[PDB]
């Protein structure tokens, strides 16, 4: 094919402590390279590479422009925040948790345990592993947070132990969708 | 920062295609179908809660397009460097034989933002009930894209996610099968 030329624009709004503090970033990119941007923290335009130097100089001489972009944290950021909050910031879907053994080898051998937590939102989530009540802090490996691209996350957390008859293994998930932590037990 | 909202748009030559969308913590709130000039919500629900004047996106694209023409000249017409995508396949939830599930094809870290994605099941390409998302932003200014294939777990049927990207040496296939 023929060479592609790309123009990227990103209007970013960063919120902390509700809307107590807001940061607005208007960034211009050409072929994966940001050359000029507006940072509400600076107040005016700036270049990120030489091609922007001339641009910034021009724009920053238009008082009406800077004036307008400085209000963006309010008219744009804090406004949009109020329009979507109820279904994004507040969005909460409870985690679906299941446990099961992985790998495969006869009695008195290798074995792993799996805790599959999925379909939750937000992503901030905590998962632990207990054995007969004691918390396990050794043979645990996690996939880490995993986006699903449909407003839901999923995570897989494994624990390597040698299952003994009569034992009780528990997976504990703490998340914003539940007042009290969820638990799923597996009995050996 | 507890939350981040991003209005991300782009124009590409010579394909002459552009996109406009909103991102909330890595998720797509909505995007505008430049063709039909219609606001498209990631979740059918959001529609009832908020509203977006599609025309707003069109006007913006016009701006991006104009800067591209100028920036493209004042940069001795240097092309963009293709960056091949990393692909990953995963199920919506733990797979249970004959229990509705979903295959997820996550294409990440690629640019320019152009890709041909197809779902293969035992070789033959499927298109029944498939779905996808426009291109999503990244910290590094690369792109992410999701494709969904609703299916039915079975011991036979095998599945593939095919990704054609000018950065690849040939179509990339990430395999998935039940054990």
């Amino acid at each position: 094919t023929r060479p592609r030329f790309l123009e990227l624009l990103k209007s970013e709004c960063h919120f902390f402590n509700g809307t107590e503090r807001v940061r607005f970033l208007e960034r211009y990119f050409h072929n994966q390279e940001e050359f000029v941007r507006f940072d509400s923290d600076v107040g005016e335009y700036r270049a990120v590479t030489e091609l922007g130097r001339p641009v910034a100089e021009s724009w920053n001489s238009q008082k009406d422009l800077l004036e307008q972009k400085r209000g963006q944290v309010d008219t744009y950021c804090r406004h949009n925040y109020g329009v979507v909050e109820s279904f994004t910031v507040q969005r909460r879907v409870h985690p679906q948790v299941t446990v099961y053994p992985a790998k495969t080898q006869p009695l008195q051998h290798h074995n792993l345990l799996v805790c599959s937590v999925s379909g939750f939102y937000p992503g901030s989530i905590e998962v632990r592993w207990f054995r007969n009540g004691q918390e396990e802090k050794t043979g645990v490996v996690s996939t880490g947070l995993i986006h699903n691209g449909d407003w839901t996350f999923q995570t897989l957390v494994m624990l390597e132990t040698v299952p003994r008859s009569g034992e009780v293994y528990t997976c504990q998930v703490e998340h914003p969708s539940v007042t009290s932590p969820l638990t799923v037990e597996w009995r050996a | 920062e507890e939350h981040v909202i991003i209005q991300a748009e782009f124009y590409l030559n010579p394909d002459q295609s552009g996109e406009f969308m909103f991102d909330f913590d890595g998720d797509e709130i909505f995007h505008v179908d430049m063709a039909k000039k219609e606001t498209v919500w990631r979740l059918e629900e959001f529609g009832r809660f908020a509203s977006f004047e599609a025309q707003g996106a069109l006007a913006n694209i016009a701006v991006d397009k104009a800067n591209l023409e100028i920036m493209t000249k004042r940069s001795n017409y240097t092309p963009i460097t293709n960056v091949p995508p990393e692909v990953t396949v995963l199920t919506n939830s733990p797979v249970e034989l004959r229990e509705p599930n979903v295959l997820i094809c996550f294409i990440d870290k690629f640019t320019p933002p152009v890709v041909n994605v197809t779902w293969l099941r035992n070789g033959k390409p499927v298109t029944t009930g498939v779905s996808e998302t426009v291109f999503l932003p990244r910290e590094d200014h690369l792109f992410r894209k999701f494709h969904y294939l609703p299916f039915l777990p079975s011991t036979e049927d095998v599945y593939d996610c095919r990704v054609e990207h000018w950065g690849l040496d040939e179509p990339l296939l990430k395999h998935w099968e039940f054990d």
Binding site: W59 | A50, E53
Partner: peptide, 11 residues
């Protein structure tokens, strides 16, 4: 009710 767009500057 309405999500507002941030209109960029022309170079």
């Amino acid at each position: 009710q309405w999500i507002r767009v941030n209109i960029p500057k022309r170079i």
